[PDB]
Design a protein around this ligand. Sequence first.
Ligand code: JX4
Length: 289
Amino acid sequence: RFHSFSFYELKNVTNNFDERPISVGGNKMGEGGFGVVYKGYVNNTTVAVKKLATTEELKQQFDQEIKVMAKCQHENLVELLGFSSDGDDLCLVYVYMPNGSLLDRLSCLDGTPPLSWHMRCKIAQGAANGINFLHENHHIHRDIKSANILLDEAFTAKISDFGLARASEQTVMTSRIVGTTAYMAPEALRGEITPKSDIYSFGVVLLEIITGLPAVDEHREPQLLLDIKEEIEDEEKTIEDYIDKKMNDADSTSVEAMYSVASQCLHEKKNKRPDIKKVQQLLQEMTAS
Ligand SMILES: COc1cc2ncc(-c3cccc(N[C@@H]4CCNC4)n3)n2cc1-c1cnn(C)c1
């Protein structure tokens, strides 16, 4: 299904996996999902090359990334073009997403203009559509976060980084708890594996979209973004206090509607959260008129 590269090809097209940042003239775009991602050029086409950084666990993440992409073609998932497995380093080659991660566009990293509310609504809907597609195909993502939501030429959202994905038919525990704490559901932090934890993480992403704040900031009060939900419930704050001020087109009704979805996704009790189909429906009604 996918194209098999030899490792040296991907070496050559990434300027020998040039570790310098893009801004300095190198090829490294960033790190995440248990790999480092490089910009490459293959036959006048820009590509992204993820080079995976236990040994059996790394191969398992590689095979898991490939199996999901073979079963899951969707407008809101990144597209795998090929891979390399010869040599000592496993690589995955993807269609290039020129507007980078939702995390960096929300922070306006490198001076990119702030996302409007209208764009943010399409991003939230698209990301929900991508997660829905995963869950319908019986996969748990386990690493949902704004650094793993990329944006193409039209700022369409595409979920990425499926190395931790698990098949999903009772909820089981794992002995190896992995993920980013600021996005993880309480039961995920205790080691449970369940699609209900994906929903919780998506709720944190929705708060990032509304507020333009990162999920964790050690020099901020509160440090954890998900803490604003309890402040709003306890009427110490309003969602208006936290709405990203770098937008001119956010109306109260639809922001409160997206906040309501986020609040439901963030229910402390996993069985009280909506499933992704419900999340998808509420986000569609959000922009209906
Ligand atoms: C302009 O930047 C990018 C363009 C781009 N096109 C495709 C990918 C891609 C595909 C599959 C997986 C994957 N993984 C990364 C690691 C964590 N989640 C994203 N990225 N991609 C990634 C970046 C990027 C990477 N780091 N930063 C800061 C930006």
